[PDB]
């Protein structure tokens, strides 16, 4: 009943509307910092010299942006990977010019999401659950680390991290493709397979379950009132479900153990998103997508183009135009 | 060839700017999310229905009992995220709804791109940009990129047009 | 910015009309209880 012990007992209470916990002790302030600086910046930050060339880019609403084109603009290339907290700037006017808010937001945000993940383990332990939901979340968290931290570390600059804006995102994914041919990288291809695949199985599982609900209601009422929160019996018939899908394809391409089915649901998108997180993280070190440029030639040595060269033409036009004022020398080596 | 199709649509149609594609993206990604989060919830709220360490064996396809605790899952997610599901029928309908809808939405956007009815520009931006050489957004930056794509890709991708672009007309930034 | 003036009345009604529909249905659901 000691002061510290009551405190420790509130932090870890499973009676708080929202669980706090020890990981929450770090997550709440870091995410409140990121959130409050993001909202204020998206609405009012002045323009930022993202690429170090004294060419500021307007990201905020009051400066002529809309919800689609606005962003918090990455910090200046002049800073590269240097740490730029507020107190290192001579004033906030300087810090705003050079993109300081982005660094503040992404660092707080990374920490707080890292702790979101631990928080997920922590409550599972206090509730008597198995622990691995947080491993599922590690794939998005990994993806966020990849585009906000790893890829900058490897390219040398937070100015090549992903902008915090809808159009900024598209900029970053366009330039990524010119510099890395990520479409031709196999880990991105598994990511597509992870994300197309999960959308498919999402709809499968939800269509097959919905197809085999047990009649509990009338046609004047939502079928959902057939289920009561915490009822002990299942609300669909999984054998009717197995019997439909197994005949749609063939018997053994359908599940009838619900534990294996849900683990499969969990594992397919998680694994595919791990890989695509790895792709962004390894392209950070310029181990780029397959290069089949001029791989086909004829008996004389003429180039016979393939679709890979068409892609390259596209990539070329992306390359020669991005950050059009920013290169004095012929190779965009980072 | 599909990859090239993806990049055609960026440079010619500015297809990322299209809300109908964006709702598609949100439905596909929303689906993969729901798939992963639902598989993981079930697998980590399992009841102990067998002695062994592999928990798969303790399911029978004919048991009437639910094999995980919807109640402990609801508490978990209420306290972690603020809301949870409470209705297992809604949950699985929602898993149907989200990705189906998203795909239907992107389809409608493509139908408009059939007619070149693109979501290509924001007029207010082009008006200010034209009058004001200091105004630059991630929107103006991305159209220089599309403009590059068009000019560098078009002669080889559309050979029937005999596009001849001499060096001096190709849009390029400094040095590259 | 030189934004279209009916953007606003379009946005306001797009929000208000379907929102009010749902509010009407919810309130009269709850006074059935």
């Amino acid at each position: 009943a000691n002061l510290w012990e009551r405190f420790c007992n509130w932090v870890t209470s499973t009676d708080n509307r929202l669980y706090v916990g020890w990981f929450g002790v770090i997550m709440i302030p870091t995410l409140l910092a990121a959130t409050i600086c993001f909202v204020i910046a998206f609405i009012a930050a002045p323009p930022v010299d993202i690429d170090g060339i004294r060419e500021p880019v307007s990201g905020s609403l009051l400066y002529g942006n809309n919800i689609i084109t606005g962003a918090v603009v990455p910090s200046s290339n002049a800073i590269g990977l240097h740490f730029y907290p507020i107190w290192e700037a001579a004033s906030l006017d300087e810090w705003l010019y050079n993109g300081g808010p982005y660094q503040l937001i992404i660092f707080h945000f990374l920490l707080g999401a890292s702790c979101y993940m631990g928080r997920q383990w922590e409550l599972s332990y206090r509730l008597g659950m198995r622990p691995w939901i947080c491993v599922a979340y590690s794939a998005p968290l990994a993806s966020a680390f990849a585009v906000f931290l790893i890829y900058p570390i490897g390219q040398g600059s937070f100015s090549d991290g992903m902008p915090l804006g809808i159009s900024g995102t598209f900029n970053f994914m366009i330039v990524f493709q010119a510099e890395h041919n990520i479409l031709m990288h196999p880990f991105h291809q598994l990511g597509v397979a992870g994300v197309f695949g999960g959308a498919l199985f999402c709809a499968m599982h939800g269509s097959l379950v919905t197809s085999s609900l047990i009649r509990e209601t009338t046609e004047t009422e939502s079928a959902n009132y057939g289920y009561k929160f915490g009822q002990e019996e299942e609300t669909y018939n999984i054998v009717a479900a197995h019997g439909y899908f197994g005949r749609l394809i063939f018997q053994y391409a359908s599940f009838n153990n619900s534990r294996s089915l849900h683990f499969f649901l969990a594992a397919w998108p998680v694994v595919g998103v791990w890989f695509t997180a790895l792709g962004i993280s390894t392209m950070a070190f310029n181990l780029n997508g397959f290069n089949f440029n001029h791989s086909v030639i004829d008996a004389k040595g003429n180039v016979i183009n393939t679709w890979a060269d068409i892609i390259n033409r596209a990539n070329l036009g992306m390359e020669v135009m991005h950050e059009r004022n920013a290169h004095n020398f012929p190779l965009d080596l980072a | 060839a599909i990859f090239r199709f993806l990049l055609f649509f960026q440079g010619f149609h500015n297809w990322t700017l299209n809300p109908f594609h964006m709702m598609g993206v949100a439905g596909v990604l929303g689906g993969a999310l729901l798939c992963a989060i639902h598989g993981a919830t079930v697998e980590n709220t399992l009841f102990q229905d067998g002695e062994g360490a592999s928990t798969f064996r303790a399911f029978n396809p004919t048991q009437a009992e639910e094999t995980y605790s919807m109640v402990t899952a609801n508490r978990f997610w209420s306290q972690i995220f603020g809301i949870a599901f409470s209705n297992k029928r809604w949950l699985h309908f929602f898993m149907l709804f989200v990705p189906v809808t998203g795909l239907w939405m992107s389809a409608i956007g493509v139908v408009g791109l059939a007619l070149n009815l693109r979501s290509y520009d924001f007029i207010s931006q082009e008006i200010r940009a034209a009058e004001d050489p200091e105004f630059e957004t991630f929107y103006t930056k991305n159209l220089l990129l599309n403009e590059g794509i068009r000019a560098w890709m078009a002669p080889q991708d559309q050979p029937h047009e005999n596009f001849v672009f001499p060096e001096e007309v190709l849009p390029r930034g400094n040095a590259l | 910015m030189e934004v279209n003036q009916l953007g606003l009345i379009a946005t306001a009604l797009f929000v208000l009309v379907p929102s009010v529909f749902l509010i009407i249905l919810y309130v009269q659901t709850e006074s059935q209880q």
Partner: peptide, 30 residues
């Protein structure tokens, strides 16, 4: 006027978050 509109909708969404968590229909058992 467009800035007021974007920020107003955002603020309404944050308000709905609040009600939907703290003022939800509580889940009850059987």
């Amino acid at each position: 006027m467009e800035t007021i509109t974007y920020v107003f909708i955002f603020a309404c969404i944050i308000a709905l978050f609040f009600f939907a968590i703290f003022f939800r229909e509580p889940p009850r058992i059987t």
